[PDB]
Ligand binder design. Sequence first.
Ligand SMILES: [Mg+2]
Ligand SMILES: [Mg+2]
Ligand SMILES: [Mg+2]
Ligand SMILES: [Mg+2]
Ligand SMILES: [Mg+2]
Ligand SMILES: [Mg+2]
Ligand SMILES: [Mg+2]
Ligand SMILES: [Mg+2]
Ligand SMILES: [Mg+2]
Lengths: 257, 49, 246, 344, 132, 102, 65
Amino acid sequence: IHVVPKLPNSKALLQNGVPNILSSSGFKTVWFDYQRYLCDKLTLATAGQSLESYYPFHILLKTAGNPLQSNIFNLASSIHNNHLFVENILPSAVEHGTNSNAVVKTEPSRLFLSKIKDSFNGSDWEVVKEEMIYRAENEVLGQGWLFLVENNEKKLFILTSNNNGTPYYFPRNQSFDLNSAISIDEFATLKQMKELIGKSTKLNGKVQDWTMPIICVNLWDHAYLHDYGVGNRSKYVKNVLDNLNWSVVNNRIFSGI
Amino acid sequence: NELREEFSAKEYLPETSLAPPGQSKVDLLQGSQAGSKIKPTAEQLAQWE
Amino acid sequence: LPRRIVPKLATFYSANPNHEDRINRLERLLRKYIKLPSQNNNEAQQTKAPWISFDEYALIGGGTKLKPTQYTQLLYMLNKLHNIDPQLTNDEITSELSQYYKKSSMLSNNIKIKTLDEFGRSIAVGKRKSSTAKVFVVRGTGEILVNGRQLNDYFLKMKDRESIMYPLQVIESVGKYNIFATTSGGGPTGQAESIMHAIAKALVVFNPLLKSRLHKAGVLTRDYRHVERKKPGKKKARKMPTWVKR
Amino acid sequence: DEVMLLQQKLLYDEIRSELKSLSQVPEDEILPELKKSLEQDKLSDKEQQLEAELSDFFRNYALLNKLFDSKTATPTKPYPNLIPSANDKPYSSQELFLRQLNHSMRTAKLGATISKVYYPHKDIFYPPLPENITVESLMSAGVHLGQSTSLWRSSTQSYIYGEYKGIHIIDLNQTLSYLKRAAKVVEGVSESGGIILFLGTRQGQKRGLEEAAKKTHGYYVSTRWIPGTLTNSTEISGIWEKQEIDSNDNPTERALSPNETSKQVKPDLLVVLNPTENRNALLEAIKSRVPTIAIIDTDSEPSLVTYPIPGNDDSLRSVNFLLGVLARAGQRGLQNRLARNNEK
Amino acid sequence: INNNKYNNMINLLNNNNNINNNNNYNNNNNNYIGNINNIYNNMTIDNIPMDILMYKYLVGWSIKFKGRLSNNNGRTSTTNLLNGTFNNKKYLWSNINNNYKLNYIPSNHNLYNNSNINKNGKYNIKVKLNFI
Amino acid sequence: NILPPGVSLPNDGGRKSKSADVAAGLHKQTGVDPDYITRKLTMKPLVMKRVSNQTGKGKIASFYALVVVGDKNGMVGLGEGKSREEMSKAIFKAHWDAVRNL
Amino acid sequence: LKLLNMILSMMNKTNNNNNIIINNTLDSLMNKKLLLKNMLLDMNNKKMNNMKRMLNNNNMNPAGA
RNA sequence: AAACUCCAUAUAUAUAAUUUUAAUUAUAUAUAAUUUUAUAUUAUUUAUUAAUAUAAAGAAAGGAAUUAAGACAAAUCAUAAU
Ligand SMILES: [Mg+2]
Ligand SMILES: [Mg+2]
Ligand SMILES: [Mg+2]
Ligand SMILES: [Mg+2]
Ligand SMILES: [Mg+2]
Ligand SMILES: [Mg+2]
Ligand SMILES: [Mg+2]
Ligand SMILES: [Mg+2]
Ligand SMILES: [Mg+2]
């Protein structure tokens, strides 16, 4: 049995949705519903199987290789990514609603900014946000996820997953929509990925990868359709990063100690 | 003077008080040139090869 | 305030309580740190821990009841805890493995590496049977002298000369050294073979990393074979007088 | 600060190479050129002062010093021996591992929490109290599966609920009643301050025995029972040393006279998980007047043990579940005794 | 005893009143390490000799009465009384090695036999003792 | 004196009752107290006889003694012991066993 | 003088066998902070050998260890 | 039983004014091995192992004494003794 986690200050979120991001109705659409739906579908998928004893992150890792076990992987990836998104947009993790310490504010960590400077071409954080929205609009037509990931090389990239593709596994990123035409370089990258996975000698055909994420923004129409109608997805993401819970984010950065 | 002052910060064995850059507070060794021994001169290596 | 007498070990009623509690402590460490993966490719941080011999463990562990399987399991678990990359280990593991390291190191001295003498000659003494031979080997041309006499005069058999020359042939340096043999004792073969052994010993000083080639050639091993004593109740040793059934 | 350590890490190795190189350099070549320079290379500057100071430095640090000396806390930083990688260099294997842990503690949990799922380790570490044991919990544990009908021992007719799929099914209401009786017999003995021995020799049981013994401050024998351990104690266990403890189970750190050590310590309660194989242990207890608790299957003789617990004995889960309940009851008794002697 | 003496060496040589140094110890041939007092500190006649003395205790002994002692039909009888152990345990565990007296008697064994004459003839009492 | 550690100086043994030795030994192995065995228990043998087994060496004779111990107040025990050295030892083992088997 | 000529030569050959002309190379004080350290530890090794050799020479203990 | 033991072996120290010479020796003490390590091919209770080979570290390979309990009414009263 998979149950939806309890979120802090749940009364505040139930009364009104995340401020500056989603309305009560919208938040109830993403969390408190379509999340219970996700959990129920996953439980019905894995009930009575060894996978039901594992957590969504571990099941998606185990399932990546198996072709026809993709439903469970898809379900688990959605659940994991969704909670990542909710946590990184949560107004305040600390249960200080009774204390009414609204003075709490979240700002990027100096290490995090330093990492942005190292990554890309040393551009400013606002420029990163703008180009991040740019790519989100141009190479994600339907639903998907927006990721700011960190690789083993200590360099942040932006992963434009076009589906429930976990950044953790680059074989399952689902970053290029093949239904539409594809450029030569992208197809070359795909063939290189074909070769890289083929090199692995493990009986399960798996490949090492770390690429754990830092920023999650839900691009599924379960989030903006109501609050931002249609075509306004760009405004939705823009406001999302404007009021992003920074304490969890800069914690996601490996402190190195 | 500064070497003496560095030694003043310690009141223990010469090796421990020395604080070599490569750590190794204890450098116990048996015999002379146990590992290095004597370098085989060129003709010995050539003859062996 | 009340007091009562109880055993030390939770395994006091087991067959070998001491070994069991030591293994229990090691298992607790091994399972509390199931992470911290093992070392990478070996030959860099392995084969450096001597651990403890069976006997040295018994006096502190199983003692009389110490079992071969118990020792193998102990060393197996010690190795598993040793095989953690040192930059993640902590003081608990090292502190517990300090006891099983033991001060296995023994001081060594009196090596006295052989070196060429003031005249650049290597002096060695071989033996065989009842023979001895002191040989001076100095670089030069293939000249040899036994007891001041020529090789052909002293050694009629050509096999003795071949044996003498073998060391200088294993290493292809037959015409680069001058031999001055001074054998004494025994018969010709014992003298010749003692000369060969002494020559092999003397050649090492000239090129120490040629020892193995000679050792594999068998010229650096001393032939322990010698006449065995005539047994009291029988004829020449290992032979008996005729035995009559009736 | 890092500038000193950034210069090839351990710098000054060139001088070590040079002194090694001159180690093989014959002295006869350079000594002549420098022996005669002393009379002419004094030059200017205070030569007497520097030579005298160097001599004093030598005396006090190389000739007159304590080379061998004499006779011979706070975990501030976990992984104190880690070598952090350079800013430009990527992560190392060890930093990758620590980064894995950082993600693992909280992020992997993101998603849906798990409920209503059986985790085997919880049967040892989080056993339930006997009062809240349900018949369903026993049935999930599998204590109701007896040995085949072809193996049945008729002396256990009253304990069996019937036969299903070729095996006898043990009644679980009876198992629960006996288990609670046994559980608070263990608690009473633990509160009294006696010695509890947990015996089990089947493969894979050691973890449960060790955990139960440490919770109840008792003893366990996962190895094979040694005949004569109780009847021939002086010969078997006379060589291993004991201690004196107070009402708080704290050692008194007092030496023991040879007579005290040579005496015999008799368990006040024996718990056996496989009474079919440890028959000699049961016979030693019955002869040595020690109450016993055992898990009785449809193959065992209930009259050998003072306090039977009808149930399955061939499954690790069942024995662990039963033994966990017993251990918790003993632990509660120990806590009650400790509270009473701390405050009456 | 060995550890105590060894520690005395180290303590004496490490300090030696912190006066004697290299080029003064005469490290070439001389072995004069220091005053005799510290060589055998706390190593005197009241502790050392008794605890290193060997062959103190009788652990095993046997007596054999062979002869015509019993007035049986006329035959002979042998009666043996073997008590204890007849091997020295401090020779195979430590580094001291047993020496065979007259090349045929273990040092730990003291044995002898004496004869006499009774009404029936001659008998012999053989006693062998082991002294650990 | 050269008494090694862990041993006691011998004392009166001829007049020391074997009952005391049995009582001390039993208390050492079992939990019984010595005073009751020495004072309130009565020794009286029942069956003393020589028992013979023959081996390759020859006939080997053993002494078999059966004794009873009681307090004349409700408890009684039976014990049998064998020994080849002497019959006093056989009675000792029987006394040991009978006190064990009360 | 306490020799010190060997001191001058070792400073002269400090950069030899690697490169004839090199500057301070971010050293402490023209390579003297840890040079005396190496000389001291070498001398300590000599004294360590002296310790062991004298211990062996004077070693005499009763057998039975 | 094995081990300690002795002859023999390798090495270290000591003694010998190298005319008792041979120092290539003699004999006192000590160390050494009932060898170790690694790899593979085997059958196996699965390296929590045995034999097959290889490799490399070694000078390293023998003989003597000791022949239990009982039995042979074995031999001995001419070794000697009663
Ligand atoms: Mg012959
Ligand atoms: Mg069963
Ligand atoms: Mg001479
Ligand atoms: Mg033998
Ligand atoms: Mg015989
Ligand atoms: Mg026979
Ligand atoms: Mg006859
Ligand atoms: Mg006659
Ligand atoms: Mg006569």
